Amino acid sequence: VPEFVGASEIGDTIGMVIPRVDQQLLDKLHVTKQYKTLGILSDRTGAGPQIMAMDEGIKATNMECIDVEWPRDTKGGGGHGCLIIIGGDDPADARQAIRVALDNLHRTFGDVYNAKAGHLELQFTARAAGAAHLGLGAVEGKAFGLICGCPSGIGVVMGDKALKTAGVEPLNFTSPSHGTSFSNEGCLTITGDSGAVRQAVMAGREVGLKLLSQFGEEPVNDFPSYIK
Amino acid sequence: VPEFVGASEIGDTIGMVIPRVDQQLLDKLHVTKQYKTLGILSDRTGAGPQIMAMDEGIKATNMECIDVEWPRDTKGGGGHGCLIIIGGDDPADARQAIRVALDNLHRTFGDVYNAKAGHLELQFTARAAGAAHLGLGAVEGKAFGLICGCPSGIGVVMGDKALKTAGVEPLNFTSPSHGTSFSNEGCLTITGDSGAVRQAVMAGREVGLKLLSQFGEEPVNDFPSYI
């Protein structure tokens, strides 16, 4: 299948490119701006990791992030899956964006921590781009941190701790009934100076791990942490 | 329990009939039109198969489809469960409709294909009826196709391929943040001539199977394909 670019067991994430999408279909897609060439990154488990991976693909190419959608998923876990549509005019440039996103999954899963009772997710970049902006509300060109815990109360405490660690600016706070697809996540997003943003993410991680462990299992990442 | 009609392991689907529903309850239900007699079809796994099954029940009776509701479910898969309420004036007719729907499950699951990573669902009819109209936006009395893939990006490619196969008319495209219960499905619905519709659905199936297989498992239907 010419549309197939690659598929990864990480999050059950598949990447595809439609070189010239049918106009009647395009007309029904909820995109910020229409383009003839579309890349598609679609996964069962994760939204932050795939969104941050796609941000590297946008930085590497001329593609634009035109839709981020939010399945309530993770195959029985508390989180989201994800659908990301990017738009451009060159199928080659789309394929390269999708390949770069797929080759960043092992990194952006590095601070996802899982346990039987729930999970934590952390993300950080010193310079957000268009996927982080559309998907997570990041301010493009500026530092960005994502601090998430499930069950969602843990995220509320992670958020409080992170804000009290350095003078970072809160962007939003999403929760089961506001700004998620009824996930069981409490997620603070932040901006500010890159060092402080990193400080605040790491503080939220530490208290998240302590809280989630209280169910009796050390939360585990399947790939090495990238936030340090 | 007089209200029980039957239960199937297929989708964990249960059918019941309330011959004369309490009016205080009926004023709390979101129905297109109130009737005193309700048929209820309720499942954990599947929305399209039950909807198309109930379409046969409507064709077979005088019952009207008055509500289709959408649990996000499939017991940890990426799809929907379903609540279908039908209404009429005769408890026996409501029961016959529910029986006909239960008896069509093995058929309407025939183009549901499952794998660890996801699933595909295809439906087709040459003449849609009231449940397909209310539930899925079909045009009654005309041909209808549903072409769905999970994770949802597979469904976007399935749909592009379907439209490029024959001149069909798209009805809608639903996706995780538009027109689903935050499901992981991308679903194209179409009408047009019955032959062109069947062509489009079959080509969507083919590319979806190829795409979903890339996770390393052949997608399996548990019942013979009907399309």
Add this chain to the structure above:
Amino acid sequence: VPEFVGASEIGDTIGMVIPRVDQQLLDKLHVTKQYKTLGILSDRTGAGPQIMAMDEGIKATNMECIDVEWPRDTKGGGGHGCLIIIGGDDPADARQAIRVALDNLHRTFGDVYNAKAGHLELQFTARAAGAAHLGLGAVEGKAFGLICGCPSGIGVVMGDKALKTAGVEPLNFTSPSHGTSFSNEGCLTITGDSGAVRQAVMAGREVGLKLLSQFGEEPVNDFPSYI
């Protein structure tokens, strides 16, 4: 972690207190009323049992229920998880509320009945308090019953039977596409005299157990029934 109060394996429920929440965060929380001190009760499986357990924490303390939020969860089952935020002036009062809620989970899971196909949930109190009000629409100071079945069509029948058992007043009926987080639950809430309310909850339980058991498995509670 000073914020930690307790964690239970019942529902995967964790209880925490923030003595002095950051004001920038509080401004982003969806609460009915700002308080400096927050108690947080959060779980993967259950909403009604945590809300009813928090009602007893409220009755025991000066805390007010200021937010109830609704994960679609139960770890692949058909129900909700829950996030409950309580607010007050005194971190010790918040801790006592959370402890009382945690110590009520074994009781409020008493009439939660699970099976492979679905589950039932019943609740009862002769006097609802603020968590049952904000969370479930109960009338404060009056008896309250909750009658819920999954898959959701079982809840419609349970609710019909309940109303026809005694003269009770329906407050709401929530369903997959109305008033839930796309759960697969049909849930009737009622008020009225306490004896009539218990009669109705119990009759709803009986018919639900019979219907859910048609899938082949007796629905089981993990804790003694309290109703």
